[model samples]
Target: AANPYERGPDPTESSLEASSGPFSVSETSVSRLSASGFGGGTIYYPTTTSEGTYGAVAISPGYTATQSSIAWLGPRLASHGFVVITIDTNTTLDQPDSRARQLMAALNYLVNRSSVRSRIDSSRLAVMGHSMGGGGTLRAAEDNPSLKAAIPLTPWHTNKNWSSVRVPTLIIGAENDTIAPVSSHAKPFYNSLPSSTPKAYLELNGASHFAPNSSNTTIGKYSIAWLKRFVDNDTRYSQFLCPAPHDDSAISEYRSTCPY
Candidate 1:
């Protein structure tokens, strides 16, 4: 059976309507990114129910990713009832701290917004990224210890300055990713983690370096479940975040590896 959750561009995104659903979205200028000379990018805000407070998920897009790159995930998270926000990197992906701080600034913005400050539960916050952003995300997570969890997708491994990550983490990678070459890419970062912390490494079969971003409907299904486990207080995320990844059933293409 085809999973009905797979949906194309939302008809409403074009008009920028104030979503009356569980959440809403918008874009704002970043003094940081603009100071660096790049035009501002969109920040997607997917808030949970106005009445029930929710945690924030700060996202860093892949290398050279503008704020709008991961726009697909924003509404998906909103629909699933979360305050999901994605950040734009002002500098190159090699500069992890810059990207990390940029995202942190966004987090600060979210927490300070009168409309969202009271509505967001700060203690449950999580951070995630992919590829270059994945490496940057780990660097960011290391720098930001207050985060409850970290999810780095097909991270480009870096050996320098990663001893700071003590938080629970989920590192996801793909088998076909020659860019990072899974073994050399993820091992160093995984080894950097303190043995005592709760951490897991996932290797998705036949996926690409961009699998986290371009894998289509499966990415949505997997991410929604991952957030639920870490940020949304739904332990059920364990079903998808663990080893032996599952194919997304939303598209119903009969994938053997993606748990749909």
Candidate 2:
């Protein structure tokens, strides 16, 4: 009860699986010309400050995609007590390395220049993305080892060696993904992380490369679990990851450095 970072009530599988959580979420739009470092995007944040401050996450979309492509995650994550930013890369065709810089810029904006900065705990933050953006998540994690967490969805990256990333990470892969197939991408990426890093790789059963684009209970539920466990340092979420999930038809695989 005394955990300052802990918000909402006790969590449950059903609670996290739902589209919303205990907090009322709201959004603010930023203009490309007005926002520095990256193209402008929307910021989804909890409307209540009753819990003091919330950790924040900056999300980027995949190649040739705009913020709208990953907009679903903004509110979904925000309603669950996080300040989520779904960003637009400076260019739709920007590479993963560029996306990584934007993700970091978005985080810096959230904790400094954004109107809701006061509601954020700058020290507790995270990053997430899909495809190339997912690759950016790993790069961003390497750029900022102090990041509380990172989630890369069906990521595609040219550089595979990520033993340098020290932040806790959760990778979501699609079993049926032909593009950035798990065998060559997600699996190798997870394997590259240092053993000392807290990490997990979840293969979504029959999902595709674009699985993270829409509303997904598995992504939402586990993402909330990962962010909560690391960003908030709330061990309450440990149960869902550790005992590790099993026999779930939605997931073809689940791997983790359990007991983190």
Candidate 3:
């Protein structure tokens, strides 16, 4: 029953096997989403569940990749008290309008679930994507008022309308990424956004799109910290996006464009 389209070895399977805490995993068949080509998603809840209200990150992974491509990100957010729904948005990544539908569906799924409904702060949701999926998140954020913030990884700008998105955003990209150059892909997109959008962008100097999501544990620390800052609204995570510790090369390569 292995997925024939899998692009690489299953990191999620391996990582989860090695992990001992922070998350509890489960699989649910989403009939509502599958009609739209969504193959469901792996839902990760924090092991230390709390009665306090929680936010969510609707994660969309890169091209031809499973929702599993973003496995590390989900548990990291979950560990810090946010529910994460990482969806497989079919095979392509730029169906912005369609992705909007998927995001709505995922939000509804979380809000309607009885077990976690009280813990979910619906107003504090965010959308995030990597590679082609980043393009989809940009399109979805334009209209999702529930989406308070967004973090697009190595995004692809379609028509340069990124400036119009009013949600707080954080952009993270690699300087050496030949697939999506930082100057052309990250910088220009950041420039297109309005100064009032409450935005931030980071150039992960030596990190690639795959590293942040895959095996690079150092950059992964920055990844978790950024989401905790924007989605979980934790002030302690500020340093990862702002002045970031000088000794941490993982952070120095990171940049921010926020009003702070």
Best by TM-score: 2
Provide the TM-score for each candidate, comma-separated.
Answer: 0.70, 0.93, 0.74
The regions of model 1 sitting more than 4 angstroms off are 1-41, 45-51, 92-94, 160-163, 215-218, 239-260
Candidate 1: lDDT of 195? 80
- Two-way lDDT contest, 1 vs 3, winner: 3
- Per-model C-alpha RMSD: 8.5, 5.0, 9.7
- Clashing residue pairs, backbone N/CA/C < 3 A, model 2: none
**Model 2 root-mean-square deviation:** 5.0
lDDT of each: 0.62, 0.92, 0.64
Error of 3 at 209 (Å): 4.1
Candidate 3 lands at a TM-score of: 0.74
Give me the candidate number with maximum lDDT: 2
Model 2: per-residue Cα lDDT at residue 212: 90
Off by over 4 Å in 3: 1-37, 92-97, 113-115, 244-260
Query: Candidate 3: minimum summed lDDT over ten consecutive residues — where?
Result: 3-12
Kindly state the number of residue pairs that clash in model 1.
Answer: 6
Which residue pairs clash within candidate 1? 246-258, 246-259, 247-257, 247-258, 247-259, 249-260
The alpha-carbon lDDT assigned to residue 118 of candidate 2 equals 94
